[PDB]
Structure formats: structure tokens, C-alpha cells
């Protein structure tokens, strides 16, 4: 009889816990919907900001990864792959301006795209210093890894941008024409 009283108490507790379980499940569903809505709002805001930025500072446009992409005025234009092979030392000047704007916008998207940089100190080190040496190796490696992370979190079409298409995938994802612009998460 004592054990039965204890069991009846535990069973009432079980029923209450199950009711709370259903309530918490509905609440978690609502919370996940709200989180998805917040992520979509971030997507839209990022798309707007990126379009505005591309229009104003860096009009990344294709010519009309060897094909060139123009941005930040006629003095700045570079092809898709990215002349990393040519950094051992306007082509040099245009490439350097494009890469400076690239690191800057990389941090910018990290904020907007929410893709926090694993090498957060991107804009400064990447843009200015003539670090052609091993430091250039490390910087280019970090840049490539970050671009890979960006393309993965925006892996709409990996085969399209393809490896060694720095300006290519850069324009594709960054330009408001991105297929899945603003997306973030897994």
C-alpha cells in the first residue's frame, strides 16, 4: 500500500510531465519557427546591404578562371581565379585594390553574412602589406579557407564557381544575383 501510494504520486507526476512535454514541444516548435524567421530577416538584410555595397564601392561585374571581373572603377579589374600565383614580388595595382576591397568586404559580410572570420584580421593584413613571402602563403591560405567557408555556407552550386575562381565565386555569391542570398546556418 505504501509503494502504491508512491507509485500513484509518481504517475500523477508522469501525467503532468507529459502535459508539460506537449506544451514544451509546441513552444520549441514556435521558437524554432521564430529562429528561422530571424535567420530569413538576416538573409534579407544582408542581401540588401551587399547589393548596396556592390553598387556603391565595388561594382563587381564580368567582362564583355581567366575572364576578368571589374570593380571599384576602371582602375580596378581582375579575373575570376585570382592572381595568387603572381604575388611572389594596373594588373598588380588593380589586383591589389581588388584584394584590399575583398578583405574589407570579407569582414563586412562576416558581419552581414554573419560568417565570422576564422582569421578575423582580414582587411588590413590582406590588403596593404607587400607580404609576398611565406607570410603571403599563410595569408592566401587563410583567404582561400575563408572563401571555402563562404561558398560552403552558400553552397548553392559548388561545381559552378569551381576551385580557382576567386573573382568568379566572389561575384556569384556576393552579387545580389546569388541563388540563395542571405542564407546562413548549417
Amino acid at each position: 500500500q505504501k509503494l502504491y501510494s508512491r507509485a500513484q504520486r509518481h504517475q500523477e507526476k508522469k501525467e503532468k510531465i507529459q502535459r508539460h512535454n506537449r506544451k514544451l514541444g509546441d513552444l520549441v516548435e514556435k521558437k524554432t519557427i521564430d529562429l528561422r524567421s530571424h535567420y530569413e530577416r538576416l538573409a534579407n538584410l544582408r542581401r540588401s546591404h551587399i547589393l548596396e555595397l556592390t553598387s556603391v564601392i565595388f561594382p563587381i561585374e564580368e567582362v564583355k578562371g581567366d575572364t576578368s571581373i571589374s570593380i571599384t572603377g576602371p582602375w580596378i579589374s581582375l579575373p575570376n581565379n585570382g592572381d595568387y600565383s603572381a604575388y611572389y614580388s594596373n594588373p598588380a595595382y588593380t589586383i591589389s585594390a581588388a584584394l584590399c576591397y575583398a578583405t574589407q568586404l570579407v569582414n563586412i559580410l562576416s558581419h552581414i553574412l554573419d560568417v565570422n572570420l576564422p582569421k578575423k584580421l582580414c582587411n588590413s593584413e590582406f590588403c596593404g602589406e607587400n607580404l609576398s613571402k611565406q607570410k603571403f602563403t599563410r595569408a592566401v591560405k587563410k583567404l582561400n579557407a575563408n572563401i571555402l567557408y563562404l561558398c560552403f555556407s552558400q553552397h548553392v552550386n559548388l561545381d559552378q564557381l569551381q576551385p580557382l575562381h576567386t573573382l568568379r565565386n566572389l561575384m556569384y555569391l556576393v552579387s545580389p544575383s546569388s541563388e540563395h542570398l542571405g542564407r546562413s546556418g548549417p
Binding site: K31, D34, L35, S37, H38, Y39, R41, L42, L45, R46, H49, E52, L53, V56, I57, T72, G73, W75, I76, Y93, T94, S96, A97, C100, Y101, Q104, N107, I108, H111, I112, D114, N123, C127, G128, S184
Partner: protein, 190 residues
């Protein structure tokens, strides 16, 4: 709830710190003129990087080009190289002799920058309630004058103004561009 909190916090931070806010990362007051976390103007007891000076000069060229292409601000000396260090500022009507923003050519770039800044202030002041008149910038003679009544004598010369006057004029340019880009961001966000 926590993930939505992080997402909405990022969204709100972006809303507060506009795209231009981060891109310029500029300040109005301090030991020097600050944009993108830079120091503008050294002192007899203040350290600063002249290479960072060239970087900020190229940044100013790019920002002025973006503003002018956005609205006017490109009457004369309006052909600027938005590349960064060793930048160039030239008139769309005149390209015979380049004006390098690095190293009388550097001071020439400074004077042409003052000219483009006055042109933008004309562009900025166009609002019904006049704007960009907490200070006034003179292009030809090298005057960085504050409409706020500050008595500090600031000039654009490479001599007699390079440490205190230069720091002050760089910070003044930073704050004026701050006001102009604040109006620009207020417009663009809408």
C-alpha cells in the same frame, strides 16, 4: 530562443552600425582622426604610421569616388584613384599631370582633396536645412576651418601644420566625411 537571440542581435547590430558605419569605422574626436580604426595626425609625443597615412589616403579617395558617383561631388579634380596607398586624385577635365596621394605633389593632392571636399559640402549642404557646416574646408589656400568657432589654427600645408594642424585637419576631414556619410546612410537605409 538562444539562436534567434544571436541572429536578431546580429541583425540589430547591423541596423545600428550601418554598412558605411563599419566600412569607415570612423570617429569624430580623439587623439587623431579615426576611420576604419586609423589614427590621423601625430604629435611630438604621439605615435602614428605614415604608411597607415597612405592607406587612409587611398581609403579617402575611394570614399570620395563612391560618394561623387552616388551624387555629384565630381565637378573638378573629380578623377580619383580608389586604390589606397600611392593613390591619385585628378580632375575629370584634366589629366596631364598626375597628383599622387603619397611621396609638392602630396600637398597638391591635399589641396585637390580640400577642393573635392568643398564640392561635396556643397553637395551635402544642398539639404533644405543646410548641412556640413560645423566647419569649412578651403582647397586652394589650405584652410580647414571649423564653423563651431574653435580657435585652433588648422592649415593643409606640409610645413607648420604637419603635427598639430595636420592631426586636426585629418580628424576634421574624418568628422566631415562622417557627417556626410551619416546623411548618405540615413538616405540609403531608407
Amino acid at each position: 530562443e538562444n539562436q534567434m537571440r544571436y541572429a536578431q542581435t546580429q541583425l540589430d547590430k547591423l541596423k545600428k552600425t550601418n554598412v558605411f558605419n563599419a566600412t569607415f569605422h570612423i570617429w569624430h574626436s580623439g587623439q587623431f582622426g579615426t576611420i576604419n580604426n586609423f589614427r590621423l595626425g601625430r604629435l611630438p609625443s604621439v605615435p602614428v604610421e605614415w604608411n597607415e597615412i597612405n592607406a587612409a589616403w587611398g581609403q579617402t579617395v575611394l570614399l570620395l569616388h563612391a560618394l561623387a558617383n552616388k551624387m555629384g561631388l565630381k565637378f573638378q579634380r573629380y578623377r580619383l584613384v580608389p586604390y589606397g596607398n600611392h593613390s591619385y586624385l585628378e580632375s575629370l577635365t584634366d589629366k596631364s599631370k598626375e597628383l599622387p596621394l603619397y611621396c609638392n605633389k602630396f600637398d597638391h593632392a591635399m589641396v585637390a582633396f580640400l577642393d573635392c571636399v568643398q564640392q561635396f559640402k556643397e553637395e551635402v549642404e544642398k539639404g533644405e536645412t543646410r548641412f556640413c557646416l560645423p566647419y569649412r574646408m578651403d582647397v586652394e589656400k589650405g584652410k580647414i576651418e571649423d564653423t563651431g568657432g574653435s580657435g585652433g589654427s588648422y592649415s593643409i600645408k606640409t610645413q607648420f601644420n604637419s603635427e598639430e594642424q595636420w592631426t586636426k585637419a585629418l580628424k576634421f576631414m574624418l568628422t566631415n566625411l562622417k557627417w556626410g556619410l551619416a546623411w548618405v546612410s540615413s538616405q540609403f537605409y531608407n
